[PDB]
Amino acid sequence: MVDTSGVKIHPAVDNGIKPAQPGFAGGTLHCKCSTNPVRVAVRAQTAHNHVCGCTKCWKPEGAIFSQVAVVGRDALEVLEGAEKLEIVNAEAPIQRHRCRDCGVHMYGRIENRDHPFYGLDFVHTELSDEDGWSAPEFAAFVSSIIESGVDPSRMEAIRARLRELGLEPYDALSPPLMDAIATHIAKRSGALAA
Amino acid sequence: GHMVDTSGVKIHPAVDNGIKPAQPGFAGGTLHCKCSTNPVRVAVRAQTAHNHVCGCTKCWKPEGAIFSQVAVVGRDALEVLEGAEKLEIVNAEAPIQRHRCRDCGVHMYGRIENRDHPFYGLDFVHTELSDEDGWSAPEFAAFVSSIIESGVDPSRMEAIRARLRELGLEPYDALSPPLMDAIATHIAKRSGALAA
Ligand SMILES: N[C@H](CCC(=O)N[C@@H](CS)C(=O)NCC(=O)O)C(=O)O
Ligand SMILES: N[C@H](CCC(=O)N[C@@H](CS)C(=O)NCC(=O)O)C(=O)O
Ligand SMILES: [Zn+2]
Ligand SMILES: [Zn+2]
């Protein structure tokens, strides 16, 4: 039906998704600085890796989408260059810590103890030299790519391309993640017990 | 002859036992609230568009229903006929001011007052409150995950989405991809990230 040639999503996925390695126990993320790079240790496997069309999250030069996962925050330690980091928006509910110099995002942190994703940092695992991280799993916030310059007419093709990558397009997060969010809201508000 | 057990799953009474089609040249009708005497009455003098079932916590739902059924109409086609003093706005700070009957609780239209909002010009109405058949029929389900926020148990979700699909109402945890892409375009052009 619809032609997918020359449709690019993110470098990490344009040639097929790379599988997790069983028993992988993490690695090191480095910023794109030639000198004094920010180095972050992620000493666990990640989960919920996906491409993301949201406007707020870091993408490499060119890519229409972002690639991002989640790790337990107590498995995160900034090793070298901690003083070169700054928050992009100190008011966004997820707080993105970013290299002052090459502008690459090193983690996103949830400071607010009642937020659904508290205890979980957002990490771009492509920032790591090692393979074996949690495979990308879907596409999040597909339609918000329009909000960063993507022409509406190009979407039929991009949704088809992600589907053929086995990366199911959603205009929010995926169903299991959207339901966990809603359950947590419901338990806090009293709509559900516990 | 089925993978998911869908027995006993109710969605909304307007889709549970038959969905009524639109009819040709349907030009509108009257909505009324549930008060036994002197009910709010409102004219909707066009056919509606983008009818759907919705899980959002803020949408009116008949007693017992887990989903709302809500559609869209040009505001210039909408007029309050009777009971204007019985109506109140739920939350004047919401993007959509829901006007509602204070004695029966039924929402009679939802209006957008910000001129910059992507659905400015369009009122939201529950055409189940009409006694006439012929309105646009539901096309999809929106804010499906939201039903948990109104206390549906999360283990009920697999059977609820399968029942959606059997009815032809594809489930989305936001709105349909077309409507989602329209909102983003409206936003992109106002920020100037797209040419006007
Ligand atoms: N439409 C999105 C906003 C939707 C949204 O709530 N963003 C998600 C993913 S970026 C979020 O969890 N918020 C991040 C934040 O604001 O901290 C955009 O491009 O601005
Ligand atoms: N978790 C949902 C999210 C709220 C939401 O996304 N609202 C949607 C659907 S009701 C909207 O278009 N807002 C209308 C409004 O501003 O009242 C809820 O049930 O409250
Ligand atoms: Zn740097
Ligand atoms: Zn009433």
Curated annotation (Swiss-Prot), chain B:
Upper taxonomic lineage: Bacteria, Pseudomonadati, Pseudomonadota, Alphaproteobacteria, Rhodobacterales
UniProt record similarity statement: Belongs to the Gfa family.
UniProt KW keywords: Lyase, Metal-binding, Zinc
Any Pfam family hit: GFA
UniProt: Zn(2+) 2 binding residues: 54, 56, 59
Cofactor descriptive note: Binds 2 Zn(2+) ions per subunit.
Principal EC category: lyase
Limits of the CENP-V/GFA domain: 26-173
Catalytic reactions of this protein: S-(hydroxymethyl)glutathione = glutathione + formaldehyde
Zinc keyword on record: yes
Protein name: Glutathione-dependent formaldehyde-activating enzyme
Pathway: One-carbon metabolism; formaldehyde degradation; formate from formaldehyde (glutathione route): step 1/3
GO molecular function, one term: S-(hydroxymethyl)glutathione synthase activity
Biological process, per Gene Ontology: formaldehyde catabolic process
Subunit-level organization: Homodimer.
Binding site for Zn(2+) 1: 33, 35, 101, 104
Keyword set includes Metal-binding: yes
Leader sequence segment: none
Protein task: Catalyzes the condensation of formaldehyde and glutathione to S-hydroxymethylglutathione.
